[PDB]
């Protein structure tokens, strides 16, 4: 976990560049109105544009940790979903798929700055994983 | 604020995957799947950059969900030259060696490739050495889109050419002794061309499938065998020509550079000497009169290696390339399985 | 940080221009009209000397040939990539990185304006000003950088250079620069057997705005022989030659 | 004496050690190795290999003749191998300088150089007739008079040729009600283009882009609410607006000239297209061409030692030879030795 | 659980290489000058050859490229200062 | 909702490229291109972490459009030591071997490198073997920023040092025969230093 | 060799922050001030 | 940092936070620097005890 | 004190594994030649961590 290269803020912006415009009227020199020349309803944004902010690199790291580690944590750390029927047989796909794991168990900040396998995962078979490339290839040889 | 904060939602990984598929596959789809833009002028000449750049392709043709869960090349792209692409790293590097701008003064060293002289040890004397050089931008340059650079404004001036030669600073008595040995006829040097082939090209008209050829009666002593592939004529300059006025393409040229990519379009080949002596004959092959390369569904029993290649073809390719096939099939030693070898390039898919 | 002298993280080799080697005040080495500039080793040449440059950068033909011969014995029967097992982490060719770029030609591009970082705008409205801070400003056509491509590409100039990190530059004392035994042919020559000689070397380097050091390794035999004649006795004879201590 | 004793010269360890220690060490190497404890000398030959006479390592030859056609040139040299020399032709090459123009379709990157973070359909601040203004004023000043926006201190006003600068804006995220705002705007006489991909050359050393006609034509435009002091000054200017590496992906109207509908246009970067010389400089020299044949002959002696054929393929033979003896994944700039390749995950979608 | 009825398609790519049919009695490399190349059958007579390829149809003109593999050799004689002479032999398919 | 949905737009790939250039190149630019922050106290000592961390660099100095289409190292960075960087993978690994915290009890094995003895076969006897060890944190540690660790609070205590040696369990008659051969002067061992240079 | 090392307060074996990394970088915590 | 001023204020709501630069600290490759070499005042010893 | 290689593996076990797999351990510890250190070999798979 060498953390994330998030020094620069990352923003999304409105489709037109700007959205919270003021309606304004052209004036001339003491000051008086204009018309037949310039329109009397111009749309001008005063200040910076409307923006929202997302940490891209932290999100990508979070998603990688959740998909490849949190979801594979031993079942004793998971819990059964609320208001959802789940199989009674832990050997089933339905059980493995519906058991819920909290993302904060392997979050962005897990053993930050360390090279460290989780004690919870040391004794879990690492080959039983969607990133087993030999098994993915053998699955793909048959088709999709 | 009462409640949760205002938030908008974006699937990052799906977007990144979408962008990769659009940039590297959708935009390279055959032009017959594209359409011309509305309210925008476009060139009438499909060989131009402007045409290639402005033709529109729908992203849903290669979207996130394209053959999901599969390892599969698109049938639309199998017969499109894969080397003509911005992810050709050799071509990107060669472009970057010159710089990042359109205007480049250049300074290059060009090697001699002709087998009869490229490794010759040349003895004392004065020799005329003359060579001829091309100026056609479609031959001397290469582009990743393969647009016609004759119409698309590239040009080149060759200002100076010098010949450089380097000499081992040999002891003079040793040099004179060596020279004298090397002037005797028993000590003539000799060289074989690496490819060691007479090269022929036969035309295959559009949509044709049957390609018969004939070589007239001649002597075959010392013949080593045959090698073959398929080329686009749009990608293959006329042989031997000073200048080909109908060459309107600047991508990779497989005939010269080895970027072959149409080998999977072969079904079979039948070889016959003297009208009716099938070769190899001798009941050697599971289909004994021809070499079947691939079989469709109806012949799947004789296919192999989880694709539509036949057992027989796989065995001939393995034996020809590595001497493997009579004492089991296995992966060849990596030093025997080079860049242009059969097994390194073999890619079965379903 | 890393300490190149001890750890081999060399990264300033491209700052060398040339070296002239002279024995006894006036005997140039190698002399003998061997090199295209025969009195010195020219490492790189600027634009004015580009004819003698090679490999698409500003390194000279001569220097490339001496480096190739010193490292791999390659240079008299063509230049080619060395076998990978001979081209190790700190070897010349593995580390050789020629590069080129174009840039606006500030004398020929009639419309040239020297616009500095304080006044460049590109992504105005969408990035912070002079800092990695909040977006600010307004959307506007960019004023920078100059386009070097397309139908209005600006007049440009080309610059060429190289990096060659990790390795040391090498000039072997061997009559054809090749490795033909550790104890070289010139090292055994009568000229160096019987007399003493003084040596001058003059290096030209690119200027750097801090103190630096020329590190010269004078390559010799540095040897010890170990004698253990009796229980708990160990004796040693050392010999470094030349440059005996 | 001392070199022999320190094993700089003389016998190897198998000769100078006692014969029993030698036998014992050879027999036991796989159990406990002793070879690294005894130095072996390596000593260069001192006679009959090299010369100590004056002699260049490399010779350069200038052409004795050059001939040009519109499609080729020919360069003749007199290659001299002096007495007491030999020359390996693999050490020879043509050193060529010249000028290349890759032309206007060369684009060695994906995306745009210009306002890449703008939404692809966001307009620049602009003006059109139906006169209407769509714009932004991000600069906060002390006051506005008919002199324009005040920027500090006797009052000091924006230098209209570059101030307010579009890169500069308020420093904090929270709403602040700016009473006196300024920004720049494009006049209706500048064609509307999306922000993304927009560039206009600077016309002053302070980054402004107003067209000079040489004095500035920047005109101040004053604004207030619809209910008296101006709240906004806009600095309107024409700039030489270009889209050097993008094109329009949505063009709302056939109609010409600025319009409200043109604010809807969207910009897409142009396709990448690397342009370069070819791998191993294929195509620069003619081979296998009877009309453009190379020459190597004694100067006295008239008869060309090169004989080539149109059905030989010299370029492809070199490609195959290089793959057979070396690792084509490695690059060498000197011969433009950088093999054409493709992204395996582009050719076969996984 | 609601997967649609499906069919399977299979194919291969084999870029970069040439397809190879050696003239050797077991297809193996046992010397450059092959056993069949030395056979009496090909030593003393002449023979004509037909080859018939079947390919998948493509909607543009293409070319079959056949390399007929032979010995393509030159021998170089330098008997006197500034004299260089050459004998070429390509066989079979001598020019 | 009448019409299309409300949407905001972000260039993902341009942002990721921007972040990579800022983190790995802009922040490592020579200090003469940086400036000191406004309204923030900063150290007066350029060798400190606080100075290196708080000096501000403008992202537009190495933006998305820097030498676009080129393979080109920045002239500003050619003479900056490239190994002093958070993407030095050997140094990251060595840092991670100790752990992720500032406080580390450590346990290491340190090899002998001096050419005259590092491969010596030592015969029966009792020998004094003594060596001297450094304590200076700027020599014994390495940082990726290269800050002066003497002023920046690193320290180290060396608590114990043992010498380990491993012996092939040689047959005793063979060992005594070998020893006797190796005590004769014709069978003296010898070693050459690998670098084989006088260093100036 | 065994011993104790203190890498000191400038050791930081990662990029980014451990704490509220997904917050916008100028978003305040909920807070109170006087005017 | 919007203000020189000290203590909480509406303006302080505008401040922005950036992560600190990474700085790995370790022993060196091959533990270079731990043992003295090539130093006449700190020379190593190997000698018969007698 | 009897652990090695910056993890909790013992000196003795490391020496037996190195000798069993590669014949390394009496004339120094070093990385084995890669062709001797295969997919299922000891050193290729050894991963100390702290």
List CB contacts of F83: < 8 A, sequence separation 6 or more. C1, C2, C9, C11, F91
Q: Which among D56, D58, D209 has the least Cβ separation from residue C143?
A: D209
Q: Which among F12, F13, F70 has the least Cβ separation from residue B99?
A: F70
Q: How far is I27 from chain D (nearest CA, A)?
A: 8
Q: How far is F156 from chain C (nearest CA, A)?
A: 17
Residue B103: strand pairing partners: D101
Q: Which among A16, A22, A31 has the least Cβ separation from residue D228?
A: A31
Chain D environment of I23 (Cβ under 8 Å)? 30
Produce one character per residue of C103-136: b if its CB has 16 or more CB atoms within 10 Å, e if not.
bbeeeebeebbebeeebbbbbbbbbbbbbbbbbb
Cβ atoms of residues E53 and B266 within 8 Å: yes
Rounded-to-integer distance, Cα B343 and Cα B323, Å: 12
A133 close to I (CB below 8 A): no
CATH topology of domain D111-269: Adenovirus Type 2 Hexon; domain 1 (2.170.9)
Quickly count: other Cβ atoms within 10 Å of residue D325's Cβ. Answer: 11
Chain C environment of D239 (Cβ under 8 Å)? 141
Q: Which among F8, F12, F67 has the least Cβ separation from residue B12?
A: F12
Which of F128, A102, C238, A54 is CA-nearest to residue D2?
A: C238
Residue with tokens 């960019």: C142
Chain E environment of D311 (Cβ under 8 Å)? 93
Helix (H, G, I), strand (E, B) or coil at F21: helix
Tokens of G32: 């109170």
Rounded-to-integer distance, Cα E92 and Cα F151, Å: 82
Residue with tokens 């500030």: C106
Chain B environment of A65 (Cβ under 8 Å)? none
Task: Characterise C33 by phi-psi region: left (phi > 0), alpha (psi -120 to 50), beta (else).
Answer: left
Helical spans, DSSP H, in chain H: none
Cβ atoms of residues E17 and B228 within 8 Å: no
H31 close to F (CB below 8 A): yes
Residue with tokens 């997904």: G22
Q: Which among B12, B13, B70 has the least Cβ separation from residue A143?
A: B70
Chain H environment of D174 (Cβ under 8 Å)? 13-14
G26 close to C (CB below 8 A): yes
Question: Which of C51, C56, C60, C162 would best serve as a mutation to test chain B binding (most B beta carbons within 10 A)?
Answer: C56
B16 close to D (CB below 8 A): no
User: DSSP assignment of A16-68, as one string?
Assistant: TS--SPEEEEEEE---EE--SSS-S-EEEEESSPP-EE--HHHHHHHHHHHHH
Chain B environment of D277 (Cβ under 8 Å)? 94, 98, 108, 140-142
Question: Looking at chain B, which subunits does it touch, using at least 3 CB pairs closer than 8 Å as the criterion?
Answer: A, C, D, E, F
CATH topology of domain B197-346: Adenovirus Type 2 Hexon; domain 4 (2.70.9)
F43 CA to centre of own chain: 25
Q: What angle do CA B339, B341, B345 make, to 5 degrees?
A: 80
Q: Inspect the interface and report whether the beta carbons of C54 and B98 lie closer than 8 Å.
A: no
Question: Looking at chain E, which subunits does it touch, using at least 3 CB pairs closer than 8 Å as the criterion?
Answer: B, D
Q: Inspect the interface and report whether the beta carbons of D171 and H11 lie closer than 8 Å.
A: no
Chain F environment of B100 (Cβ under 8 Å)? 67-70, 72
The CATH number given to C1-96+163-219 is 2.70.9.10
Question: Looking at chain D, which subunits does it touch, using at least 3 CB pairs closer than 8 Å as the criterion?
Answer: A, B, C, E, F, G, H, I
Q: Inspect the interface and report whether the beta carbons of I48 and F97 lie closer than 8 Å.
A: yes
Cβ atoms of residues H16 and G25 within 8 Å: yes
Which strands sit side by side in the sheet containing F103-107, from one edge to the other?
A: F103-107, G2-6, F155-160
Helix (H, G, I), strand (E, B) or coil at B342: helix
Helix (H, G, I), strand (E, B) or coil at F142: strand
Q: Inspect the interface and report whether the beta carbons of C138 and A9 lie closer than 8 Å.
A: no
B169 close to C (CB below 8 A): yes
Chain F, 73 to 112: residues with Cβ < 8 Å from chain B are none
Rounded-to-integer distance, Cα G5 and Cα F102, Å: 8
Rounded-to-integer distance, Cα C166 and Cα B173, Å: 41
Helix (H) or strand (E) holding A139: helix A133-142
Cβ atoms of residues B293 and E17 within 8 Å: no
Which of A123, A140, A17, A29 is CA-nearest to residue A73?
A: A123
Residue B278: strand pairing partners: B272
Rounded-to-integer distance, Cα B30 and Cα B232, Å: 14
Residue D266: burial class (beta carbons within 10 Å; 0-12, 13-18, 19+): middle
Q: Inspect the interface and report whether the beta carbons of G11 and H25 lie closer than 8 Å.
A: yes
Chain D: residue whose CA lies nearest to F167: D32
Chain I, 19 to 48: residues with Cβ < 8 Å from chain A are 47
Quickly count: other Cβ atoms within 10 Å of residue B19's Cβ. Answer: 15
Produce one character per residue of C45-82: b if its CB has 16 or more CB atoms within 10 Å, e if not.
beeeeeebbbbbbbbbbbbbbbbbbbbbbbbbbbbbbb
Measure the CA dihedral E55/E57/E59/E62, to 10°.
10
The phi and psi torsions of B138 (rounded to 5 degrees) equal: -70, -15
Q: How far is F127 from chain G (nearest CA, A)?
A: 21
Q: What angle do CA B35, B41, B46 make, to 5 degrees?
A: 55
Cβ atoms of residues B332 and B343 within 8 Å: yes
DSSP label at residue H20? P
Rounded-to-integer distance, Cα B39 and Cα B33, Å: 19
Chain C environment of D102 (Cβ under 8 Å)? 149
Helix (H, G, I), strand (E, B) or coil at E24: coil
Own/partner pairs, I6-10, CB within 8 angstroms, 24+ separation = I6/F97, I6/F98, I6/F107, I6/F108, I6/I48, I6/I50, I7/I48, I7/I49, I7/I50, I9/I48
Pairing of strands D156-157, F155-160: unpaired
Q: Inspect the interface and report whether the beta carbons of I1 and F167 lie closer than 8 Å.
A: no
Chain A: residue whose CA lies nearest to G22: A55
Cβ atoms of residues F197 and C218 within 8 Å: yes
Q: How far is H27 from chain C (nearest CA, A)?
A: 11
Cβ atoms of residues C19 and C201 within 8 Å: yes
Distances (CA, A) of F195 to B35, B56, F192, F199: 67, 63, 9, 10
Q: How far is B184 from chain C (nearest CA, A)?
A: 23
Helix H, strand E, coil C: the string for chain C is CCCHHHHCCCCCHHHEEEEEEEECCCEEECCCCCCCCCCCEECECCHHHHHHECCCCCEEHHHHHHHHHHHHCCCCCCCCCCCHHHCCCCCHHHHEEEEEEEEECCCCCCCCCCCCCCCCCCCCCCECCCCCCCCECCCCCECCCCCCCCCCCCCEEEEEEEEECCCCCCCCCCCCCCCCCCECCHHHCHHHHHCCCCEEEEEEECCCCCCCCCCCEEECEEEEEEECCCCCCCEEEEEEECCCC
* Pairs of CB atoms within 8 A across F/I: 24
Residue with tokens 């057979």: D324
Cβ atoms of residues B202 and B233 within 8 Å: no
Q: Which among E15, E28, E91 has the least Cβ separation from residue B319?
A: E28
Quickly count: other Cβ atoms within 10 Å of residue B43's Cβ. Answer: 16
Quickly count: other Cβ atoms within 10 Å of residue B28's Cβ. Answer: 22
């Amino acid at each position: 976990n060498h953390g994330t290269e998030d020094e620069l803020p990352n923003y999304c912006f409105p489709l037109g560049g700007v959205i919270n415009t003021e309606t304004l009227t052209k004036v001339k020199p003491g000051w008086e109105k204009d018309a037949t020349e310039f329109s009397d309803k111009n749309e001008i944004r005063v200040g910076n544009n409307f923006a929202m902010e997302i940490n891209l690199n932290a999100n990508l790291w979070r998603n990688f940790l959740y998909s490849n580690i949190a979801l594979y944590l031993p079942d004793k750390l998971k819990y059964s979903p609320s208001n959802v029927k789940i199989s009674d047989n832990p050997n089933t796909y339905d059980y493995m798929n519906k058991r819920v794991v909290a993302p904060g168990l392997v979050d962005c900040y897990i053993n930050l700055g360390a090279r460290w396998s989780l004690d919870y995962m040391d004794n879990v078979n690492p080959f039983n994983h969607h990133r087993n490339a030999g098994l993915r290839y053998r699955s793909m040889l048959l088709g999709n | 604020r009462v409640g949760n904060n205002f938030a908008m939602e974006i699937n990052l990984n799906a977007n990144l995957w979408r962008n990769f598929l659009y940039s590297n596959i959708a935009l390279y789809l055959p032009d017959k799947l594209k359409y011309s833009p509305s309210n925008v002028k476009i060139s009438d000449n499909p060989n131009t950059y402007d045409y290639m750049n402005k033709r529109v392709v729908a992203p849903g043709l290669v979207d996130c969900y394209i053959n999901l869960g599969a390892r599969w090349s698109l049938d639309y792209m199998d017969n499109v030259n894969p080397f003509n692409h911005h992810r050709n790293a050799g071509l990107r590097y060669r472009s970057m060696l010159l710089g990042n701008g359109r205007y480049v003064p250049f300074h290059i060293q060009v090697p001699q490739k002709f087998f009869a002289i490229k490794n010759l040890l040349l003895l004392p004397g004065s020799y005329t050495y003359e060579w001829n050089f091309r100026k056609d931008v479609n031959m001397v340059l290469q582009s990743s889109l393969g647009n016609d650079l004759r119409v698309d404004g590239a040009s080149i001036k060759f200002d100076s050419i010098c010949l450089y030669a380097t000499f081992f600073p040999m002891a003079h008595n040793t040099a004179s002794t060596l020279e004298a040995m090397l002037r005797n006829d028993t000590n003539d040097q000799s060289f074989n061309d690496y490819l060691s082939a007479a090269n022929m090209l036969y035309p295959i008209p559009a949509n044709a499938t049957n390609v018969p050829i004939s070589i007239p009666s001649r002597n075959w002593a010392a013949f080593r065998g045959w090698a073959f592939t398929r080329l686009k004529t749009k990608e293959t300059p006329s042989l031997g020509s000073g200048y080909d006025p109908y060459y309107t393409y600047s991508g990779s040229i497989p005939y010269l550079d080895g970027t072959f990519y149409l080998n999977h379009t072969f079904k079979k080949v039948a070889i016959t000497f003297d009208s009716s002596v099938s070769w190899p004959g001798n009941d050697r092959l599971l289909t004994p009169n021809e070499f079947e390369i691939k079989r469709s569904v109806d012949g799947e029993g004789y296919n192999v290696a989880q694709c539509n290649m036949t057992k027989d073809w796989f065995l001939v390719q393995m034996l020809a390339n590595y001497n493997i096939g009579y004492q089991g099939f296995y992966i060849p030693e990596s030093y025997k399985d080079r860049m242009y070898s059969f097994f390194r390039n073999f890619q079965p898919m379903s | 940080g890393s300490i190149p002298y001890l750890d081999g993280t060399f990264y300033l080799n491209h700052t060398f221009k040339k070296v002239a080697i002279t024995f006894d005040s006036s005997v140039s080495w190698p002399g003998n009209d061997r090199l295209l500039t025969p009195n010195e080793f020219e490492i790189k040449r600027s634009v004015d000397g580009e004819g003698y440059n090679v490999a698409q950068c500003n390194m000279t033909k001569d220097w490339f040939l001496v480096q190739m011969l010193a490292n791999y014995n390659i240079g008299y029967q063509g230049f080619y990539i060395p076998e990978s097992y001979k081209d190790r982490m700190y070897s010349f060719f593995r580390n050789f990185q020629p590069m080129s770029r174009q840039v606006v030609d500030d004398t020929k591009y009639k419309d040239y304006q020297q616009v500095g970082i304080l006044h460049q705008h590109n992504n105005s409205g969408f990035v912070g000003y002079l800092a990695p801070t909040m977006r600010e400003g307004q959307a506007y056509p960019a004023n920078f950088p100059y386009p070097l491509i397309g139908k209005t590409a600006v007049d440009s100039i080309t610059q060429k250079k190289f990096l060659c990190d990790r390795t040391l530059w090498r000039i072997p004392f061997s009559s054809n620069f090749m490795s033909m035994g550790a104890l070289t042919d010139l090292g055994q020559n009568l000229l160096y057997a019987n007399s003493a000689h003084a040596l001058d070397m003059t290096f030209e380097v690119d200027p750097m705005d801090e103190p630096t050091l020329l590190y010269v390794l004078f390559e010799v035999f540095d040897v010890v022989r170990v004698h253990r004649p009796h229980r708990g006795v160990i004796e040693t004879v050392y010999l470094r030659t030349p440059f005996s201590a | 004496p001392q070199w022999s004793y320190m094993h700089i010269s003389g016998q190897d360890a198998s000769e100078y050690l006692s014969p029993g220690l030698v036998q014992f060490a050879r027999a036991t190497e796989t159990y406990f190795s002793l070879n690294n404890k005894f130095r072996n000398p390596t000593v260069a030959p001192t006679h009959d290999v090299t010369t100590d006479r004056s002699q260049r390592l490399t010779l350069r030859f200038i052409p004795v003749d050059r001939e040009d056609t519109a499609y080729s040139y020919k360069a003749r040299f007199t290659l001299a191998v002096g007495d007491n020399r030999v020359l390996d032709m693999a050490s020879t090459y043509f050193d060529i300088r010249g000028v290349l123009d890759r032309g206007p379709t060369f684009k060695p990157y994906s995306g745009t150089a210009y306002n890449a973070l703008a939404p692809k359909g966001a307009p620049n601040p602009c003006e059109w007739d139906e006169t209407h203004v769509f714009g932004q004023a991000p600069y906060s000043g002390i006051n506005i008079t008919k002199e324009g926006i005040q920027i500090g201190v006797t009052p000091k006003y924006a230098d209209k040729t570059f101030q307010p600068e579009p890169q500069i804006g308020e420093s904090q995220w929270y709403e602040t009600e700016i009473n006196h705002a300024a920004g720049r705007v494009l006049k209706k006489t500048t064609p509307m283009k999306p922000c993304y991909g927009s560039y206009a050359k600077p016309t002053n050393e302070n980054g402004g882009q107003g067209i000079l006609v040489l004095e500035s034509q920047v005109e101040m435009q004053f604004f207030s609410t619809t209910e008296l002091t101006p709240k906004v000054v806009l600095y309107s200017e024409d700039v030489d607006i270009e889209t050097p590496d993008t094109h329009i992906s949505y063009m709302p109207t056939i109609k010409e000239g600025n319009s409200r509908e043109l604010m809807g246009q969207q910009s897409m970067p142009n396709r990448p297209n690397y342009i370069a010389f070819r791998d191993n400089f294929i195509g620069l020299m003619y081979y296998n061409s009877t009309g453009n044949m190379g020459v190597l002959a004694g100067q006295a002696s008239q008869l060309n030692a090169v004989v080539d054929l149109q059905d030989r393929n010299t370029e492809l033979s070199y490609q195959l030879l290089l793959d057979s003896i070396g690792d084509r994944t490695r690059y060498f700039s000197m011969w433009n030795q950088a093999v054409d390749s493709y992204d395996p995950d582009v050719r076969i979608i996984e």
